[PDB]
Write a protein that holds these residues in place. Structure first.
Motif, short mmCIF file in Angstrom:
data_model
loop_
_atom_site.label_atom_id
_atom_site.label_comp_id
_atom_site.label_asym_id
_atom_site.label_seq_id
_atom_site.Cartn_x
_atom_site.Cartn_y
_atom_site.Cartn_z
N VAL A 1 0.82 -1.23 0.00
CA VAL A 1 0.00 0.00 0.00
C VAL A 1 0.87 1.30 0.00
CG1 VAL A 1 -1.91 -1.26 1.11
CG2 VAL A 1 -0.49 0.27 2.49
N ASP A 2 0.33 2.38 -0.58
CA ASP A 2 0.98 3.68 -0.67
C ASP A 2 0.51 4.63 0.44
OD1 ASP A 2 2.94 3.84 -2.83
OD2 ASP A 2 1.27 3.35 -4.17
N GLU A 3 -0.62 4.31 1.06
CA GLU A 3 -1.23 5.10 2.12
C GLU A 3 -0.48 4.99 3.44
OE1 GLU A 3 -5.34 6.12 2.06
OE2 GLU A 3 -4.72 7.44 3.72
N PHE A 4 -0.24 6.15 4.07
CA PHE A 4 0.31 6.24 5.41
C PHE A 4 -0.88 6.36 6.34
CE2 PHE A 4 4.82 6.15 5.75
CZ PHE A 4 5.34 6.57 4.55
N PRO A 5 -0.93 5.62 7.48
CA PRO A 5 -2.12 5.72 8.35
C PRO A 5 -2.28 7.05 9.05
CG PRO A 5 -0.42 4.38 9.43
CD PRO A 5 0.08 4.67 8.02
N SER A 6 -1.16 7.60 9.55
CA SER A 6 -1.11 8.79 10.36
C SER A 6 0.00 9.77 9.95
CB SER A 6 -0.99 8.39 11.83
OG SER A 6 0.23 7.73 12.15
N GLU A 7 0.19 10.87 10.72
CA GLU A 7 1.17 11.91 10.46
C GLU A 7 2.54 11.52 10.98
OE1 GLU A 7 1.20 15.83 9.64
OE2 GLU A 7 0.08 14.86 8.00
N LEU A 8 3.59 11.67 10.14
CA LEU A 8 4.98 11.36 10.46
C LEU A 8 5.88 12.45 9.97
CD1 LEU A 8 5.31 8.02 8.59
CD2 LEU A 8 4.85 8.14 11.00
N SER A 9 7.16 12.42 10.40
CA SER A 9 8.12 13.37 9.86
C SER A 9 8.55 12.92 8.45
CB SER A 9 9.33 13.51 10.78
OG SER A 9 10.16 12.37 10.71
N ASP A 10 9.20 13.81 7.68
CA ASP A 10 9.73 13.49 6.35
C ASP A 10 10.78 12.37 6.47
OD1 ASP A 10 8.33 15.53 4.68
OD2 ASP A 10 9.64 17.02 5.67
N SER A 11 11.55 12.33 7.59
CA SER A 11 12.56 11.31 7.93
C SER A 11 11.89 9.95 8.12
CB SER A 11 13.33 11.72 9.19
OG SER A 11 13.68 10.65 10.06
N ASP A 12 10.84 9.88 8.96
CA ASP A 12 10.08 8.66 9.26
C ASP A 12 9.43 8.13 7.99
OD1 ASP A 12 10.70 8.86 12.11
OD2 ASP A 12 8.91 10.15 12.42
N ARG A 13 8.88 9.04 7.14
CA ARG A 13 8.27 8.75 5.83
C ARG A 13 9.27 8.05 4.92
NH1 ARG A 13 2.96 11.15 4.13
NH2 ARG A 13 3.44 10.33 2.05
N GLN A 14 10.47 8.64 4.78
CA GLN A 14 11.60 8.16 3.98
C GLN A 14 12.09 6.77 4.43
OE1 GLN A 14 12.87 8.66 1.14
NE2 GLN A 14 15.10 8.95 1.13
N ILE A 15 12.24 6.56 5.75
CA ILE A 15 12.66 5.28 6.33
C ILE A 15 11.64 4.18 5.97
CG2 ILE A 15 13.08 4.05 8.55
CD1 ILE A 15 14.22 6.99 9.43
N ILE A 16 10.34 4.46 6.14
CA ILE A 16 9.27 3.51 5.81
C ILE A 16 9.32 3.15 4.33
CG2 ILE A 16 6.78 2.99 5.79
CD1 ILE A 16 6.82 4.83 8.46
N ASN A 17 9.32 4.18 3.44
CA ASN A 17 9.40 4.05 1.97
C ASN A 17 10.57 3.17 1.52
OD1 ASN A 17 7.02 5.65 1.53
ND2 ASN A 17 8.22 7.51 1.10
N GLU A 18 11.76 3.36 2.12
CA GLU A 18 12.94 2.55 1.85
C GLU A 18 12.67 1.08 2.19
OE1 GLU A 18 16.51 3.41 4.08
OE2 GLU A 18 17.79 2.75 2.41
#
Lengths: 112, 9
Positions: A21-38
Motif C-alpha cells: 500500500v501507498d497510504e500512510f495511516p497517520s502523520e509522520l516526519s519526512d525522515s520517518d516517511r523516507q525510512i518507511i518508503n525505503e
C-alpha cells in the motif's frame, strides 16, 4: 518445526500475490516517511526476487497486503480500511504492518 | 495456504 514452518511458507509464497500500500495511516516526519518508503521498497524486492511472489498493483486482488503501519492506525476514510472492514462483515486476505512483514521476511532467512 | 504468519511456539 520452525524449519518445517519456513519450508511450508517458502513453497506457498511462490503461489502468493503481495501488495504494498501507498497510504500512510497517520502523520509522520519526512525522515520517518523516507525510512518507511525505503523498507517498503526493500520488502518489495525480497518478495519478488527472493521469495518469488507475484506483486499485485491492486490490494483487493492479493493474498498478503503490506501496510505503512498497523491497520487499526488507518483512518475510516482510507480505502484500505474500508476494504478491511468489508472482510470482517463478510466471511480472505492478510494485512501485515511493515514491522510484522520485516520480521516474517527475517524468519524466511532475509534481513533488510 | 492459511498457516500462521508467526513461527510455532
Amino acid at each position: 518445526s520452525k524449519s518445517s514452518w519456513r519450508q511450508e511458507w517458502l513453497a506457498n509464497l511462490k503461489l502468493i500475490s503481495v501488495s504494498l500500500v501507498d497510504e500512510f495511516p497517520s502523520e509522520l516526519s519526512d525522515s520517518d516517511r523516507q525510512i518507511i518508503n525505503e523498507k517498503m521498497q526493500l520488502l518489495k524486492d525480497i518478495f519478488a526476487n527472493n521469495l518469488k511472489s507475484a506483486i499485485s498493483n491492486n490490494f483487493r486482488e492479493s493474498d498478503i497486503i503490506i501496510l505503512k503501519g498497523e491497520i487499526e492506525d488507518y483512518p475510516m476514510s482510507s480505502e484500505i480500511k474500508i476494504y478491511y472492514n468489508e472482510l470482517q462483515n463478510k466471511p480472505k486476505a492478510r494485512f501485515w504492518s511493515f514491522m510484522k512483514t520485516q520480521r516474517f521476511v527475517s524468519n524466511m532467512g532475509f534481513d533488510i | 495456504t492459511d498457516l500462521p504468519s508467526d513461527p510455532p511456539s
